[PDB]
Amino acid sequence: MEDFVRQCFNPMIVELAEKAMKEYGEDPKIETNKFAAICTHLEVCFMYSDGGSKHRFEIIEGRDRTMAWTVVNSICNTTGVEKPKFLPDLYDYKENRFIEIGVTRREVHTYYLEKANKIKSEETHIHIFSFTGEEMATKADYTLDEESRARIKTRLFTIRQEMASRGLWDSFRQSERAAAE
Numbered sequence: 161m162e163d164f165v166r167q168c169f170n171p172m173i174v175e176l177a178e179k180a181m182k183e184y185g186e187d188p189k190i191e192t193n194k195f196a197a198i199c200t201h202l203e204v205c206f207m208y209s210d211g212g213s214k215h216r217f218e219i220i221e222g223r224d225r226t227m228a229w230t231v232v233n234s235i236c237n238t239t240g241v242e243k244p245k246f247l248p249d250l251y252d253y254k255e256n257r258f259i260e261i262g263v264t265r266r267e268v269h270t271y272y273l274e275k276a277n278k279i280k281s282e283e284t285h286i287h288i289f290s291f292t293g294e295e296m297a298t299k300a301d302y303t304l305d306e307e308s309r310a311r312i313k314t315r316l317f318t319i320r321q322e323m324a325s326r327g328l329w330d331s332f333r334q335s336e337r338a339a340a341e
């Protein structure tokens with residue numbers, strides 16, 4: 161699984177997933193599934209950010225935490241929007257709202273609600289993608305055009321196929337459920 165991750169995602173994404181895991185004392189060599197999940201989540205964050213006009217999104221995910229909060233503070237004090245209790249993934253200068261992005265190997269609506277309750281914030285938009293091509297957004301708003309979202313979905317499904325092809329997919333779909341329970 162480890163070797164698969166390093167040739168599936170780019171070094172920058174891998175590099176940042178490693179840091180993210182290390183910051184919390186977790187080891188990518190042992191918890192290889194969570195390693196893959198983090199690379200995936202980052203890739204989706206980046207793609208999502210790229211989907212818009214050039215300066216539309218501030219990227220909050222994939223930074224050192226302290227600098228992230230600083231940028232969040234800047235946005236809140238700048239635009240009037242409420243400070244969220246949990247670190248979001250993006251800010252949308254176009255729509256004037258923070259975005260949390262989810263990637264589940266489980267049901268889109270299940271994951272959506274686990275998130276929605278935890279944040280407990282009306283302002284933060286929520287956007288969930290599955291490895292099977294479904295997506296769910298708050299108020300049925302997807303932010304991006306159909307083209308952008310389709311590229312994301314395609315990419316996720318490619319990751320699933322690539323894992324399945326090597327026998328790593330079952331173990332990976334297992335991990336999330338076990339983590340939840």
Ligand SMILES: O=C(O)C(=O)CC(=O)c1ccccc1
Pocket residue numbers: 180181183184186197198201263
């Ligand atoms: O699993 C995901 O989708 C994450 O986005 C995970 C993440 O950011 C993280 C950060 C620090 C430690 C462990 C996971």
Ligand SMILES: O=C(O)C(=O)CC(=O)c1ccccc1
Pocket residue numbers: 201221247249261262263
């Ligand atoms: O799951 C996700 O989509 C996250 O975006 C998770 C995340 O940011 C995080 C940060 C710190 C600890 C655990 C998860």
Ligand SMILES: [Mn+2]
Pocket residue numbers: 221247248249
């Ligand atoms: Mn995040």
Ligand SMILES: [Mn+2]
Pocket residue numbers: 201249260261262
């Ligand atoms: Mn997220």
